[PDB]
Amino acid sequence: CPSRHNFDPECEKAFVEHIHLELASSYHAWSMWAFYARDCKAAVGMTRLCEWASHVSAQRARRMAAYVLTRGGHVDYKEIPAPKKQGWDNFEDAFSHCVANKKRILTSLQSLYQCCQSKDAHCSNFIQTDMMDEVIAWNKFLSDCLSNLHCIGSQGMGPWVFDRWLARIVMSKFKHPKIPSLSTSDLESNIPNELFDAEGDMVRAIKKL
Amino acid sequence: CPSRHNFDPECEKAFVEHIHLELASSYHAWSMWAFYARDCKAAVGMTRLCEWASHVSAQRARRMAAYVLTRGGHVDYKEIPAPKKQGWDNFEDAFSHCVANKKRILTSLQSLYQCCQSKDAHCSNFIQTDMMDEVIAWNKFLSDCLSNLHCIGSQGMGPWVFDRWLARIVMSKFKHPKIPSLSTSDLESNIPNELFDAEGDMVRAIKKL
Amino acid sequence: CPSRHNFDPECEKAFVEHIHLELASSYHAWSMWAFYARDCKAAVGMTRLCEWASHVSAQRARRMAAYVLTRGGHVDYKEIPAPKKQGWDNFEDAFSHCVANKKRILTSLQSLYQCCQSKDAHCSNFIQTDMMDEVIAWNKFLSDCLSNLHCIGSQGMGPWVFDRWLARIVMSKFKHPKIPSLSTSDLESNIPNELFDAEGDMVRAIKKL
Amino acid sequence: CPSRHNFDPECEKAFVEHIHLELASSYHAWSMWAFYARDCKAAVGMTRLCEWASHVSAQRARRMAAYVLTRGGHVDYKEIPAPKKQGWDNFEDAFSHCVANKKRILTSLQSLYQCCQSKDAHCSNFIQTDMMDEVIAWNKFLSDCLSNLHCIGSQGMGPWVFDRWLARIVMSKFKHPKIPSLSTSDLESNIPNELFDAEGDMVRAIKKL
Amino acid sequence: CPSRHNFDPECEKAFVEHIHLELASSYHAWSMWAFYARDCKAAVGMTRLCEWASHVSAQRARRMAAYVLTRGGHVDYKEIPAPKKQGWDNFEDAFSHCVANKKRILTSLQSLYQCCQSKDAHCSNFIQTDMMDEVIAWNKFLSDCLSNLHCIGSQGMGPWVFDRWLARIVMSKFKHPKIPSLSTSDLESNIPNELFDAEGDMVRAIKKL
Amino acid sequence: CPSRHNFDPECEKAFVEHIHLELASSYHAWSMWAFYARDCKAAVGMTRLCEWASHVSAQRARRMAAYVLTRGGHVDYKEIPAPKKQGWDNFEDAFSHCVANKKRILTSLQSLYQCCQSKDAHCSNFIQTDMMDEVIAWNKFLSDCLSNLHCIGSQGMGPWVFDRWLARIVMSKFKHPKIPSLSTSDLESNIPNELFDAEGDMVRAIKKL
């Protein structure tokens, strides 16, 4: 690419660093999702919450990369580290871990805003609108859940009831759809391949209406 | 977890290795997507294709992890390496790279099937049905695209027309929906937070019908 | 205003006093609402109940002022004192506080009825129909809730389950709509201001039908 | 509450002060509403406008309190002073009073923004988006009304015609709905109380559909 | 352009001159629109009328340029002068100014018709049908408004009532729609840019029906 | 106007200067539109794009003037200069010209934001939200088009295919509606004029429904 100008290089470097931070957070949500789906754990609410969190983090990383590309910069990708701890004694530890991660993300975003505030107004507005609001809302939600868990306790069937309630409230908002793909079903109908005749299909449809 | 039995440990280790391979492929698709979206490249068809491929690979990794968890095993996650090359001279190089990756994936899957064939019939059936068909179909599609590109050439406006056609045929099958999240809009309406009243909303809806 | 006759001045003074009492009750509900919405409390049911109570008290004060104005009197407003206690150890204390406030309101209303009974029949009918019924019903509801809470206990997850149930039953009856306002969105469309062309809009609508 | 951290204490104090300012403005609108509804005044347009203004101010105070609670702070409520003047010679004086109040509110908000600008980006964005826009729009509308009134005059039937027009344009935007409550109607049907069987009702409804 | 023949050069020059006259009239309507929208004027009817007039004049200039291009000529653009007076004592002066401008436009059009009448029949028909009718109708409307204003007077609330009526009658005929544009909302969905995938969208739509 | 206070005079002057800049850009788009519509050029896509750009620039100028009027200032209009060059060798030159103009606009807006940042928070928010986003998006789109054109070439039928595609994608978003006007058709039906009976028509319509 013979064009990487306009955008300030230091801001570009900091943006790429934050992109990698978001990718690491998305990866770490996967480990929690896998941990709580074991046949000896079977906690449906935590599973749904962790899946939703991982998808949200991936979308945030994609959005920041798209913003960097819109201003005319380049994005360089590097190594993604493995999560350190892959087990939790109870729900309180997991919620505390998530709260600490949110605080770290907010600190990084504030540093970015401070860096880009003097020159680029649009960049600072993007930082303070499209990236911070989600973090603030998620932090409030997680803090409320943590307070409720601390009040309820950690023995008996209290955690089970809490998990059922959490699954109910999470499923009312998020539901991941399936990703379509290709297969060898009906081989005799798609001889070269399935996609190559798409245009033709469109013509057929117009003749039906 | 005091339960990790039944599933053969060697098969579990090989399955985890293949999961990491799929995750690496998904990560590498992101670099191509970012490369072809630069303001000095602006190739819409390649962008759509790479986005679709990354989502497909992520779904495949999730499916294999779910199968391991269903049989009673554990999944341990480790480091994801960075892609080596992040630039391509023309479309032919990118398509060749993808074809080679597909061949590597197929070889790994065949080794897995050979390992698990003697004892576990269900595992071998899962390998040969739910994992190989997608790879075979994608390999055929990519080979057809590569042959067409080689016939067309690499100079003039041929690649531009090919890219427009590719975008048209890809968009007829895949369209990634947005992931819902939380925000601070309408603060006075969701005082503790937005999710905590979900159950109440349901009751209201029943009274309306 | 050169007209303040007909209505008995002593009745007018007592009515104004009761209006200020209702306003004070409405203000005190706000403190409870703010207390139970803290991130370290997060009790959704109590929040909904307190919000509903504050709105009900405000409506009652408005109704009494409207009745005074209908009979030809004047309303003079004075200072609203701050609530004394702004913290509660458990739900039982809050419910007891509300019950005591209801008893005080009922005593004041009975005194008003006694004052106005001899001369004005319409005023006494208004007092005994439009002001007392709400208080009686609310007192019964709060007493039932208090008895249930005392039976349940104050330790473990009993209060959490009670709070969830309370939110469910309150939300089935009350939902505060948003108050519309003015903004600077679409500045080029409402040049003087948004309201000044309302009449014109009406004409347009008639031409569409 | 063992948690009041994160939020800067000086910003919290200033926010609470502004909350009390908004509450005072909401209270003062009530006096104007009561003044213009007397049987010797009977100005419908001014009544509607003052009612709308009081509701808007109350909503603004609620929104600021909710924002403070979301960031993890506490809200402490204090005394609300009585309005000073409770009579106006003509509409021009009332409109001038409202304009001056709007200017005072804007100055306070600007001071808040200056205080919180250096450290918290999200707080400053909230101040400049969710609080200032309404004030600017309302100030423009009130200034336009004041200019029209000054041009029209103050004698004859000019003010009366203006009052009809104002009522017409205000009523096209705002309409306060009734607040539901409890009563003793149909006593034999709701024996413990009306709310306690809400869940049961829902089941019945599902069986009807 | 190696083709500028057929069309008579003198007619082309006169047409370009009239195009610039229409553009100047459109520009001058903007100043009146801005003058009557000040917070110390706030005349909604005059604002609507001036906005409509400016749009009409711009459309007329576009139509004349299109006619010149259809016959095979060229259009050369030059400087647009500023309006001389930017204030008016009352509505009568503004209406008189508009009437005088209409008379000037009609004189110019008559000169054009005289110039092109001998040779080109189609050009003269275009002048007498597509350009004069609007001017005649607008002149009649403005003269009627001026007579009504002169009869009404210039003191009291007469002009204000007239302004409401004018706004009502203008708004029943004209309403300028918003012009769509591009933005950075939903950045993650339109990665290269929003327009480049339009064709693909069409295919998707056909598959839905 | 005896009222021009509140708004800072230096900010007002800078705003008026930027308004004139936007008007000049809108005027210059007209010359390109006229150039590409000649019978010896006949490029439909460029014609549509230039028409859309001119309308967008006019709307932006109107929006900035409306914002100045809302804050209580005055707008003074001056002379609009003629465009310098009115011919282009190929599409690349036109796209480069547009990109340079966008860069100039962005620099001016950044200077405005710097000027108004210290005192007025609402003004700076308006600058960074309602004026910069459009420029950023349009710059990205034009850069993508320029890169595609440079890759395609400048000889043969490549530009023709590109122009057809550009027309297709532009027309999917923008379509300028006709501006209604007055005429002398059906003279016997609208005797004084067409508008004067509008109110009566409304009554008739109500009687039909």
Author numbering:
A (entry chain I), B (entry chain E), C (entry chain J), D (entry chain Y), E (entry chain V), F (entry chain A): 22 to 230
What does the article say, verbatim?
The protein artemin acts as both an RNA and protein chaperone and constitutes over 10% of all protein in Artemia cysts during diapause. Importantly, several biochemical studies point to the chaperone activity of artemin being regulated by a redox switch courtesy of the thiols as well as its C-terminus which diverges considerably from ferritins.
We provide a structure of full-length artemin at 2.04 Å using single particle cryo-EM coupled with cell-free expression. Therefore, octahedral symmetry was imposed in subsequent steps of 3D reconstruction and refinement and led to a final map at 2.04 Å at 0.143 FSC. In total, all residues for artemin except the first 21 N-terminal residues were modeled. Artemin’s loop L′ contains Pro198 and Pro201 which potentially prevents this region from forming into a helical conformation and helps favor the interaction with the inner surface of the shell. Somewhat surprisingly, loop L′ and helix F extend and contact neighboring dimers which differs from all prior reported homology modeling efforts.
